[PDB]
Amino acid sequence: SGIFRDVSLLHKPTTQISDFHVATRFNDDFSRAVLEAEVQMCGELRDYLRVTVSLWQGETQVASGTAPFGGEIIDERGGYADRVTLRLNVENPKLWSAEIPNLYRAVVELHTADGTLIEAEACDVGFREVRIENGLLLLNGKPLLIRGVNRHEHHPLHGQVMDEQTMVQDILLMKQNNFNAVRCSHYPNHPLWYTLCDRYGLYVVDEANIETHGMVPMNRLTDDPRWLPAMSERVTRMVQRDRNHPSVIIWSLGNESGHGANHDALYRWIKSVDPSRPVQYEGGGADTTATDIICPMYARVDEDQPFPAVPKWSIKKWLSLPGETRPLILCEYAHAMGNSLGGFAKYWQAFRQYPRLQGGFVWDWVDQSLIKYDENGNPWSAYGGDFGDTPNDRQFCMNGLVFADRTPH
Amino acid sequence: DEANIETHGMVPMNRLTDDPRWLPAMSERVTRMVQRDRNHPSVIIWSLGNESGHGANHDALYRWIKSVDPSRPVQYEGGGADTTATDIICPMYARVDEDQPFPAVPKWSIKKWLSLPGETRPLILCEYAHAMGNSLGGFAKYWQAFRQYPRLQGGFVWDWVDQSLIKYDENGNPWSAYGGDFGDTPNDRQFCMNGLVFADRTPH
Ligand code: NA
Ligand code: NA
Ligand code: NA
Ligand code: NA
């Protein structure tokens, strides 16, 4: 517990940019793109107000557009007078991917017609298209093969406080170890994380802070309308916050919370607000109506585990169940707990032979061990119960590929 | 029930079946079969023939049956086992886990075949586990797979009886003959014996 992430103060003018959405759409071969920027304001509405959205490639400005507020007509009562959408044509754009994290800089200026800048907000932009077609998850028209890992925000000394140093470090080891994607298990991460992924180049699964595993049954709350409000905010605010990061390629509804009507609602909400990205969720069986990807945890390659209500089929069999057509990406697989990862190659071989097996996210990145001190001030690695904490689940918080200090297993 | 159409030796295999001038002769072989056997309950699937590649003639005829006898599915393995002239993915000799990615007409692992992007048909091998001489090694692997995957709905082993023919020696005693034993040539020797039982019906 505590004030574990940054605290700050921000000054905005009275007439301000209260929101902005950045989208990139492409032509059949990506040789041409349209960057669309929706900008919203708070402040007195005035005729002389303008928005200028400019696109830069390094120190080169590649595109720009300016316009007064007042969106198009949308219904019988009109349109959003406090909004406006800029559309910028980009030819032969340099595309973003984890292999080549090309980025552009988008600068949104709020200013007077005549020139006076009120404020400017900005972001990095990755031109890329994420889309599921014919059962495959494509990136820029090509099928991804996910080399992922789940990663909590954990630090042996600091606990749940995340610093750039550590983040950078995690990123590099992952890249140096052939990983191309990471899952935010199981909550939106510290802001800087997304920026780093954008820049170094990693595919990200951004996940809502919603986990009700201890319930009985698991969907006790998620299936209850009375909890829909609290849940919705865990989803909506995430989306509103991270929708412009190119690194984020999929949204996730949370984790281990069974499957409830609430998930369905929320799933549709997202699809509605941001069609640019697929939505997945593993709860209730991993192939529910609330997920665009079959995303099981721990399904085996060849071996079926027919649990009731929520079987975990052999991943290869799962794909060809009658009527099934989705891609399969394990949200969790290969539990790296201790002396583990036996049978890892087996998964890879399957991922390589079957087109719709587009990989998965190993469970997980780093051991959740906390440093303690002995009678003579020497530090040692602690786990559940080592703090008088009980009930506890002992070493089960230690399942990483690397030790808490980042030394590899 | 399978129309009497096989043009295996053409180069490429669909040389005639893709020719509209052969449509007619081909049509009769399909139509007259349906016309004749359409009342037998035992017939559950129609087959367009065998090893004649994949040509337009097959699409037209596939359509003819569907039209005239919606009661039964039509299958055809030529041209790749999963062409638009077949309701059933019905490959010959596709392996359980092992891909054989021949160009133009690959034979994927059956388990893999079912879930290729956009694929939804059931799969029943029109030919499998080639029973020539001391064979059938790996038969169990298929059974396990068929049992495990709903869409893997079995197949037809190749084949039931050895095509040996009886000949006699000076002594007047009978012997089982094969390819070339009659002075025939060119011939394919023992290739005509792929059965589960010998010609006299004695099991292998
Ligand atoms: Na694959
Ligand atoms: Na754990
Ligand atoms: Na089956
Ligand atoms: Na033969």
UniProtKB/Swiss-Prot annotation, chain B:
Coiled coil: none annotated. Changing residue 127 to Q: 10000-fold decrease in the beta-galactosidase activity. The active site is at 51 (proton donor), 127 (nucleophile). Mg(2+) 2 binds at residue 187. Transmembrane segments: none annotated. Na(+) binds at residues 191, 194. Substrate binds at residues 51, 127-130, 194. Mg(2+) 1 binds at residues 6, 8, 51. Changing residue 130 to E/F/N: Poorly reactive with galactosyl substrates. Less stable to heat than wild-type. Homotetramer. Belongs to the glycosyl hydrolase 2 family. This is Beta-galactosidase. The chain holds residues 412 to 615 of 1024 of the full protein.
